[PDB]
C-alpha cells in the first residue's frame, strides 16, 4: 500500500498473509480474505505459479511473533475457469482456497462479510485497502500491515478515455487515483473494504496497477468485483 498508514493491529481480522515456500524459508506474495474457517478468496494471478502455498491469519508484523498468529497449509485451489494469465485486463482475477484445516475464530481471527450479488457502489464511496505490499513503486513490502482510504471510481468514469479506457469491465471495481495512494504488488490478492449499511465488506480482490507505476494520477488501482462473482463463489464452497 503507498501512501498508507500502519493499520491497528487485528483492526482488519479477515486479512490474510498468502506466502510460498522459497527453499527453507516462507515469503509473503499476496494478501486474501478468509470467507469461511477453511476457505481463503484472493487473486488468481497469486496462484497461477506451482509453489508451495501457507496462509497465515491473524498477522500483523510479519517478521515478528505478535502473538496471535495461525499457520496452515492450502489444501486446494480453485482458479476461476476463464482466468487467463495473459489477460488480466479480461478479468476473472479470483481464485477460492481450500484450507488443510479449519482456522479457529477469535479477537484476531474472522470471516470477512461479502457483498450481495450484483451489488454496484456508488461513485466516490468509502472504502479501504489494506495489505503488507509495496510501501512505494518498485520499493519493499511494508512489516506491518497498512492501510490508505481509497474512494471507488464508478465505471463509467474509470473506464473513460482519462482514466483506464477499455481496460478495465464493469466485473471490476476501480478506487483511488489521487495520485497519492494506491494498492501496490504484494496487496494483490487483498481485499477492498466498503462500508455499505454501516457495515464494511469485501467488495473487491485487489487484482492491477499500471505499469507506469502503482500510485498515478487518473490511473486507480484495478479490483475484481466481488459482487460479480458470488453465485460462483457459493457453488465452489457447496460442492468442495
Ligand atoms: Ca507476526
Same mark, same amino acid.
Given at each position: 500500500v503507498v501512501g498508507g498508514t500502519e493499520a491497528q493491529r487485528n483492526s482488519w481480522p479477515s486479512q490474510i498473509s498468502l506466502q510460498y515456500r522459497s527453499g527453507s524459508s516462507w515469503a509473503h506474495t499476496c494478501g486474501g480474505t478468509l470467507i469461511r474457517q477453511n476457505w481463503v478468496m484472493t487473486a488468481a494471478h497469486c496462484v497461477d505459479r506451482e509453489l508451495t502455498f501457507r496462509v497465515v491469519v491473524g498477522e500483523h508484523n510479519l517478521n515478528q511473533n505478535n502473538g496471535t498468529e495461525q499457520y496452515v497449509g492450502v489444501q486446494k485451489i480453485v482458479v476461476h475457469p476463464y482466468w487467463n494469465t495473459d489477460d488480466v *485486463? *479480461? %478479468?476473472? $482475477?479470483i481464485a477460492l482456497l481450500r484450507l488443510a484445516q479449519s482456522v479457529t475464530l477469535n479477537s484476531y481471527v474472522q470471516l470477512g462479510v461479502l457483498p450481495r450479488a450484483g451489488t454496484i457502489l456508488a461513485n466516490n464511496s468509502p472504502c479501504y485497502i489494506t495489505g503488507? %505490499?509495496? &510501501?512505494? &513503486?518498485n520499493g519493499q513490502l511494508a512489516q506491518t500491515l497498512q492501510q490508505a482510504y481509497l474512494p471507488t471510481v464508478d465505471y463509467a468514469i474509470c473506464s473513460s478515455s482519462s482514466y483506464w479506457g477499455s481496460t478495465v469491465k464493469n466485473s471490476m471495481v476501480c478506487a483511488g487515483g489521487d495520485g497519492v495512494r494506491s494498492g501496490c504488488q504484494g $496487496?494483490?490478492?487483498g481485499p477492498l473494504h466498503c462500508l455499505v449499511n454501516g457495515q464494511y465488506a469485501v467488495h473487491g480482490v485487489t487484482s492491477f496497477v499500471s505499469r507506469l507505476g502503482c500510485n498515478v494520477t487518473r490511473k486507480p488501482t484495478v479490483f475484481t468485483r466481488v459482487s460479480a462473482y458470488i453465485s460462483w463463489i457459493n457453488n465452489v464452497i457447496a460442492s468442495n
Open positions: *485486463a *479480461a %478479468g476473472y $482475477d503488507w %505490499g509495496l &510501501t512505494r &513503486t $496487496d494483490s490478492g
